[PDB]
Structures are given as C-alpha cells and as structure tokens.
C-alpha cells in the first residue's frame, strides 16, 4: 500500500440461481483461471470472467438449498495469497471505467444423481442481508440458460489499502436480478468450500 504506484483491490461476486426442479445431490468442482473462475454444482455450471478488471479470484464457496444454487467468488488476504491482486494506477483507472463482470450459466442437470434430501429448510429469511444499490450501471453482464427460473448477482470491488494510504478508491458495486419487486438481499450465511 506504498504507492509504487501500485493499487491493491479485492473483489466479491455473488451468484444465486433458482432452477426449475429441486436440486440433485452433486459433487462440487471449481476452477480458478486467469481473471475468472467457474464452479459446477447442483446442476449448474456458473462461470465468471473479469473483462478489463486486472483482478483474480482466490476462492469459490458454494451453497445449495431447495431449488437454488449459490456461488461466491472472492479474493482472500491480499498480501499473503498468490497471485497478488495488485495493479498500476492506470490499470485501476481502466478498471473503474471499463471492468465488466461477465457471468455465464450452463445447465448440467445430471439424472444419475438423486434429489437432495430435505428435512427442514436449512436456510431462513434472516440469513439474507440487504446490500447497497449499484453505483456502476451495467458492470454485470449475464447469460442464463433454460433450466434457470431466476438469477441474482452482485459484485463488490473494493480498496484493500483504504485504511491506510491517506486516501481511498471508491468501492464499485453492481446488482442485477431477473426477479421483480424483491428486496436487494444476498445470502450472508458462510458458504461451503468447493
């Protein structure tokens, strides 16, 4: 955080997708690649590519409940995790103006897996928390697929040196949902590892 001038940013991308049948029990598989990541879980492959963002994900968590798959792509401690999410100031300017979080859903419902067992609902309304509104329009681009009834997505890109440097980079937020008349909420429960 010692203006090289390098900037250090973090990123969280949340994807929630409700499918058209109750979920089948699957084995989770995730892959992090250069400026993106993907996860195959619950009958859906969710892929996130970061276009002109100059940022890498470090972790993918998942959740599955009823008919809904959740994924959280995130960065971790930025000074101890490889690859380091640092960038020049000119690259941060381009991130600010041009970063797109390109989300792609692919249905992969597998009839060789039985339906998830369901006792009592493992999620409850007070597991979802409101998030602030978008401050960057059209940062999220989403492609859905036929088996998906609704998708919700949220991105937060933030300064890791904000508390610290003497100045801070504005947090960039966007939110997109196919749902109508629903509050701006995301699952805040701790996700499972993939």
Residue numbers in the entry: 6 to 199
Q: What do the paper's sentences say?
A:
The A41 protein from VACV strain WR is a secreted 30 kDa glycoprotein and very similar proteins are expressed by camelpox virus, CPXV and all 16 strains of VACV tested. A41 is secreted from infected cells and has a primary amino acid sequence related to the vCCI family of poxvirus proteins that bind chemokines. Collectively these data show that A41 binds a subset of CC chemokines (CCL21, CCL25, CCL26 and CCL28) via a site that overlaps their GAG-binding site, but A41 does not inhibit leukocyte chemotaxis.
Electron density was observed for residues 26–219 (numbering for mature protein begins at one) and the structure was refined to 1.9 Å (final R = 20.4 and Rfree = 25.2). A41 is a single domain protein with the distinctive β sandwich fold seen in the vCCI class of poxvirus chemokine binding proteins. Eight cysteine residues in A41 form four disulphide bridges (C6-C166, C33-C199, C58-C104, and C112-C152). The absence of the 2–4 loop in A41 may explain the specificity of A41 for certain CC chemokines and underlies the weakness of the interaction.
